[PDB]
């Protein structure tokens, strides 16, 4: 069945970060890994995220949001950083494990 898919889409809409025009990955808290991850993003993706983020902040300061039309649709939310971030973590765990041996 599609239970898991029903839930996710629900939570995705429940969270509501898409009303700001942000993408799942735009909301990631910038801890050590996410930091390295971002540095690896190709310039075009970096600049775009930056605009998105800056735009979201401006909405926040304005106490507004984007018109329904412009909201990020669950199925079109691009996971632009996730791939990078995973390797960044793969790498770390390797080092962490190796320095132990």
């Amino acid at each position: 069945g599609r239970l898991m898919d029903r839930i996710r889409k629900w939570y995705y809409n429940a969270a509501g970060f898409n009303k700001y025009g942000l993408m799942r990955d735009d909301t990631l808290y910038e801890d050590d890994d996410v930091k390295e991850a971002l540095k690896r993003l190709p310039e075009d993706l970096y600049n775009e995220r930056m605009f998105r983020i800056k735009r979201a902040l401006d909405l926040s300061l304005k106490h507004r949001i984007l018109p329904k039309e412009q909201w990020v649709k669950y199925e079109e939310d691009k996971p632009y950083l996730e791939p990078y971030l995973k390797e960044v973590i793969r790498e770390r765990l390797e080092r962490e494990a190796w320095n132990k041996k």
Binding site: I7, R8, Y11, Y12, A14, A15, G16, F17, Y20, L22, R24, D26, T27, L28, Y29, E30, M50, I53, K54, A56, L57, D58, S60
Partner: protein, 271 residues
């Protein structure tokens, strides 16, 4: 922002000691009696209990030698608060303020002045109004009338309870029947703040985009309201049980629910 936060907890603790000793100064029924019950609590600490209390009291019971050292403490602590506030803001400035969306705000920062100097001066008058309205129209709306009676060691008031801002913990104190456990529970009720940073499981910083965590948050608030209320009522049914219930939900929410719902939330985002 761990260090900003940890100094913060220290400010709270300090403010408590300060406001506690302050309240004894007018030496009224409640001043004295509250001081006698609250300070005696430590007597439950094993072996070094009684000693530590009689030391603090400067004698065998709250008497003149206490009143003086409290006045001393009360005059002192505020200044320590001021000092520590400087440290608080010092750590704070390392990172800069956080913001409602919880995402890096470097792409859009503004000079404190005039934006926030103005915004704060506005928020100052917005709150200051109710403060003055109260302080001037309903002066004793919050104070126990029992404190208009000079302290008298031969008349225990019917219901000895601390100031409102303490009730919530006084409540958790009576939840655990056992002089010792209840003290610790009290201590933990506030010291728990030091753990918050280590109980953050969400991949996001704020709760702006975490509806689950949000109700959990407002639940907890409501929970504190009830605890406050319980603290104000006597120790009898149905209060006693509601008390223990609220006290339990308090620690459960901060120690188990929050971090758990946090993790669950990550899976629902496909993280």
């Amino acid at each position: 922002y761990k260090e900003t936060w940890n100094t913060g907890v220290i400010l709270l603790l300090t403010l408590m000691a300060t406001a506690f000793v302050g309240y004894v100064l007018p030496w009224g029924q409640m001043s004295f009696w509250g001081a006698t019950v609250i300070t005696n609590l430590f007597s439950a600490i094993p072996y070094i209990g009684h000693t530590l209390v009689e030391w603090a009291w400067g004698g065998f019971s709250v008497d003149n030698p206490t009143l003086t050292r409290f006045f001393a403490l009360h005059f002192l602590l505020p200044f320590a608060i001021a000092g520590i506030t400087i440290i608080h803001l010092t750590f704070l400035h390392e990172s800069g303020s956080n913001n409602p969306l919880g995402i890096s705000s470097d792409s859009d920062k503004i000079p404190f002045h005039p934006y926030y100097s103005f915004k704060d001066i506005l928020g100052l008058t917005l709150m200051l109004t109710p403060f003055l309205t109260l302080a001037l129209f309903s002066p004793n709306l919050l104070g126990d009338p029992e404190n208009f009676t000079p302290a008298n060691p031969l008349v225990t008031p019917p219901h000895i309870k601390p100031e409102w801002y303490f009730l919530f913990a006084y409540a958790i104190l009576r939840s655990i029947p056992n002089k010792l456990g209840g003290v610790l529970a009290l201590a933990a009720s506030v010291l728990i703040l030091f753990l918050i940073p280590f109980l953050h499981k969400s991949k996001q910083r704020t709760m702006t985009f975490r509806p689950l965590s949000q109700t959990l948050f407002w639940l907890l608030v409501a929970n504190l309201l009830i605890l406050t209320w319980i603290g104000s009522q006597p120790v009898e049914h149905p209060f006693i049980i509601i008390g223990q219930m609220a006290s339990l939900s308090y620690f459960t929410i901060l120690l188990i629910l929050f971090p758990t719902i946090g993790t669950l939330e990550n899976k629902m985002l496909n993280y």
